Symmetry: C3
Subunit: 516 residues, 3 copies
């Protein structure tokens, strides 16, 4: 039994990567350690994907052991699944197009230095393990937390350094790109936020470098996977009789009339092929039509044509703000933007831990049935309001906000930030200033790129980069980003954030006008 260690300094802290001695049956496993906070990360990738499949089964697990802090207790906890998401987000888009083999990443914290948060350490481990595994993965990736103290950027600030920080942000990217950003801020500017992202992305390059060396020394041979064929002949004679007819069908304004022409196009086209050949699995055929359709829309947006509902790239849907909606609640509000709506409440009684945010996403919000996601959205919406909350001494009452997503087709989470803002004011909570959220999208093709404001549910495919921003008129309180494409520069981000600031301000304008 012989371990392979690789050590390096990651600004102020020493990071060690040990592999080859533990869990040798996993596809690859790494014990990442950073100044006494150790997370053992493992990875298993099934060798053969089910027949056809049609869906990449990627699942990350983050477990925190209480013995890791020298304590005896007396799931998974929501916080644990939040960090699992923090790891899943950046690595998920790096798996090649077509890879549908099951992959499970398990991260479990084995030792904890109360000053060094296990999260980025676990992210580092998942990147190392995945890279060493040889599973088709276009990594590695780095991970960094950026703080803001004395108006200067800080690299991986300790838990108490954060007490004097005005920013808590996490960025993860490869060598040439930022993939995901998750943050909470005390009303900073897009420019300051952008600087944290770029700073972090650069500072973490040290990590991607070491992982690379370790892969040279201990890495396994890259799988000889192979994408698995695409019937580019079938979906060639599908586009042959639908492509053009559809690009025209998308020019007719009457919404319900557009579906008709499309449905005709999809009906005629399928029947015509089932007559040429046959036994062609309509399902797959319809699956191809849906694709040239999503591309017809992608081509129209890039060309400057109206979005699917008629809006232009910067248009926000119709707002509607109502306060004091429920009789016996300390504070209620009904914020609705287009087709996504949120009923929000505030209750008081004898910061966070003093501030509680709960999110509910019933199935009827999307006109469906099902059991009665609301976990990651809740944390985002909470970060979006944190900046505005009173100093506890200014308001000695624990406050709890609850959001009911009654409608959804845009971004329930951003909508619940606005409702929370309103409800708290309706409850008499002395919040620093109203706060609002907006969900954006960025579609790109070569150099032609377009920023979208208030993305629809069915505009998700245009989100080569979809991001959320929340704050008041004076600054950004929360910023979340997820990039799945390359290119997209810091300059392009500046543009994107600016258009998002506009949308925010527009929404605040309507909000401030509601609560006179």
């Amino acid at each position: 039994l012989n371990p392979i260690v690789r050590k390096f300094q990651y600004g102020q802290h020493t990071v060690t990567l040990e592999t080859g001695m533990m869990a040798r049956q996993a596809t690859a496993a790494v014990m990442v350690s950073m100044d006494d906070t150790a997370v053992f990360v493992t990875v298993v990738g099934q060798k053969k994907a089910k027949p056809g499949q049609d869906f990449f089964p990627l699942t990350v697990n983050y477990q925190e052991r209480t013995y890791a802090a020298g304590r005896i207790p007396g799931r998974p906890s929501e916080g644990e699944t939040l960090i699992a998401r923090l790891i899943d987000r950046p690595i998920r888009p790096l798996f090649p197009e077509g890879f549908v083999n099951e992959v499970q990443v398990i991260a479990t914290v084995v030792s904890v230095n109360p000053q060094v948060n296990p999260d980025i350490v676990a992210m580092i481990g998942a990147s190392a393990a995945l890279s060493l595994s040889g599973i088709p993965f276009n990594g590695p990736i780095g991970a960094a937390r950026v703080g803001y103290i004395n108006d200067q950027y800080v690299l991986n600030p300790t838990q108490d350094e954060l007490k004097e920080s005005k920013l808590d942000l996490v960025v993860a990217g490869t060598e040439a790109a930022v993939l995901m950003v998750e943050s909470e801020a005390q009303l900073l500017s897009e420019d300051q936020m952008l600087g944290a992202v770029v700073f972090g992305h650069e500072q973490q390059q040290v990590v991607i470098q070491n992982i690379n060396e370790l892969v040279k020394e201990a890495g396994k041979p890259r799988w000889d996977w192979q994408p698995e064929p695409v019937n580019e002949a079938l979906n060639a004679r599908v586009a042959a009789l639908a492509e053009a007819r559809l690009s025209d069908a998308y020019r007719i304004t009457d919404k319900q009339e557009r579906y008709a022409q499309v449905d005709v196009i999809k009906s005629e086209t399928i029947a015509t092929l089932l007559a040429e050949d046959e036994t062609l699995d309509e399902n797959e055929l319809g699956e191809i039509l849906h694709a040239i359709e999503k591309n017809v829309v992608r081509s129209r947006v890039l060309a400057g044509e109206p979005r699917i509902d008629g809006r232009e790239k910067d248009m926000i849907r119709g707002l509607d703000v109502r306060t004091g909606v429920l009789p016996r609640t300390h504070g209620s509000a009904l914020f609705t933007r287009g087709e996504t709506q949120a009923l929000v409440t505030a209750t008081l009684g004898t910061r966070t831990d003093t501030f509680l945010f709960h999110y509910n996403f019933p199935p009827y919000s999307v006109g469906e049935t099902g059991m009665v996601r609301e976990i990651g959205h809740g944390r985002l919406a909470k970060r979006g309001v944190l900046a505005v909350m009173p100093d506890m001494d200014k308001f000695p009452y624990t406050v709890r906000v609850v959001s009911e997503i009654t409608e959804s087709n845009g971004s329930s989470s951003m909508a619940s930030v606005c409702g929370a803002s309103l409800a708290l004011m309706d409850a008499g909570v002395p919040i620093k200033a109203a706060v609002a959220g907006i969900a954006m999208g960025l579609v790109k093709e070569g150099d032609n790129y377009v920023v979208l404001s208030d993305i629809l549910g069915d505009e998700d495919h245009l989100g080569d980069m979809d991001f959320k921003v929340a704050g008041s008129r004076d600054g950004i309180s929360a910023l979340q980003m997820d990039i799945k494409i390359e290119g997209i520069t810091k300059e392009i981000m500046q543009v994107a954030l600016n258009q998002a600031k506009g949308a925010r301000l527009h929404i605040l304008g309507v909000m401030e006008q509601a609560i006179n």
Copy 2:
């Protein structure tokens, strides 16, 4: 965004129905409010039922939000699923015969006036929402709680008015019929109980009227669903060679010999058709035989013939009562009636909340396997005993009863009322008087109707109305009814209840004789 409100007085309270502004994606949604207690009720009905299906997927969800009462907590709770049942029961039989599309009703309490119970308010909402939806539904329905104070009926008594009430009953019906009744009473008479049912049914008509007007103004177009064809030709030549042979097979007394003749009939008949045609899906064929069989029995009972086990409409199965069955329990009993049996226990130690009733229904009670319903049955059996419990000052001990349904083929819940009665006496609990329960059935055809005492498990199909009654010799402590047919008048109910009183008394006679 424009809401449609409809307001009306519901005796002492003002009821408001708001629709069209929230959750516009649900098939229909209503915010029902009654003197500050608001429940937002929603409804979603899938447009297309699975292929064939053979089973109506109706599911109701009742959620109570703690913020609704201005409080911060610190599922679903059993009480929440009890009320979900309270809503499901009356609306479930109103969906046309053959409708198998999925339907989900979600009711969530958004504001609570401690004096106005959210339950009837949620029932009202589910009726409004369902009606407005346009889903094939023969409603609406009303809902009312009836109390008994100063020997007079009370409409929707407040929580503290109930402290001076001797009756807590809930009735729900359409315009021409009562569909379900759930109650708890302090030993009243069938006549007084009947008066509460009828009174409530009339008083709630105001509700069905307003819902109707709202449907005129805001209702959606009725679905163009259509029942979906019945092969009345296949199950015509199935009855052609089985109908008569079966009506005779049901005249032979030897139980095990009767099955034989039937099984022969079912075997020969299926084989004969598979020889005429073929590829006829035996399963469906057997599914048709089971139907003319259940009808042969239905025709025999209406004609005055003996039930399937030999009994006459008023006969109760053989009883058997045993006390002090378990060595170390404060109180035990083994009550068995026919083929349904209950092992019941009582434990004491330092009213309800002081009185706890738990129910267990293992799978071997029906000769089956499975995980180890016992929730709605438990509440019923508890109401059945409540009336008899001592005044707490007369007996300063919290008491807990547990019922184990060791056998089942009639009504485990009524059996557990009898066992609880016995066990408590065996434990020395100064109960006012012994109490017993009986599960009845009412089968009707035009004007010819028959009341059945102590219904069997496989007599459930004869229950056009099946109901339960429990009490002592002096009165009724619990009454539960579920009607799925029209006609059945108050006069017919009087008859039914009377035959049930007889059965009760008969059981009490045997019980009182056990515990000398």
Copy 3:
């Protein structure tokens, strides 16, 4: 309703078996009682096994009612599932070869005498019920707990008699054989342990005798089940072209080269038959090859040939011991034996209840994916360490050990006993002496038998008897056995245990050398 009782003295205690009055719908049900501790045990066996099936669905359920002890609470609990295992283990191998009908045994405690443990009483019940049922079952079985006080064996010692006992062991067997043993001991000798097993097996014969009489008087007619045909013609011409080639393929040492020759053999053989006949369900064909293969190995081991990995019957895989592996834990260790590994931890802070053992078995330990068995293994490993723990007054600190099975291919549980030993020493816990565990196997054919040390994961089929032993250099702290074959005498056990003592000592030698 008429019950059939059968009473008899079981040394110091009176055992009563009542059947025929409760749960008459279960295939059979018995109320077993022993000096006031009563457990009602039931059994249901589906009459027809699914089509083909290929897997015996046996499931035991043990429930403990709090009213059984005259108390009001205020799952199943892990302890409850431990006892369910205690019942499942001995009865599971008694179901004839080929029986795949579902069988569920439910045991629920109805009365508890704090002195007489419900467990053996429930075991007795499951044996009685199963026997009476008539389900194909080669029982009955008995059950006995054996204590060790004043250097003499004790039959079913009471809970406080155990306070002065140096042994807590449970044995269950038929008339001619011991099937399962589960124990915890204060460092006794194999000889003393063996004496408890044999003593218990003899003492419990009184039980198997009475159950037999009761079956004569009340038992049901034995099912006319019938094994269900084996295509001994197909797997005759599979062995015809694979048997010999495989027995040779298993002589080549190169591991990866052996698989190759085998895979060729399996490939060629299947293709050749699919050419003779066809539509032969390869799956079933491969299912037959796997069988003559497992038999080729079984024949080689009995003949004295090397095991599949090259080892001889007494060889233990390569060890590796590491201490102080994690930075902030009070005590850590990395014990690895061959391909099974355990990361173990110890945390201190303000015997058992004062001693906590938790076990984790992630799916990557076997190179697989899945949800994140670890319950029965944890209890065993804990018993394995109990003997060594300080007298609480010698060490006033509650200690908690956690084991992470990072690798598995032998016996994670025995490995976690060794790690726990180490970790506790690393934490400074004054344990009496180091302790280790070994998992053995015994393969038998007529009179030729072979004992295997440190069984592999894929050697499980050679375990006609597989057992585990744990202890220090001075004695045995835990002993678990599971026999699925007949013959195997006490003399043969003596041999087996002795070879296991050797393995233990060998492991302790390496361990004591690690922690200098």
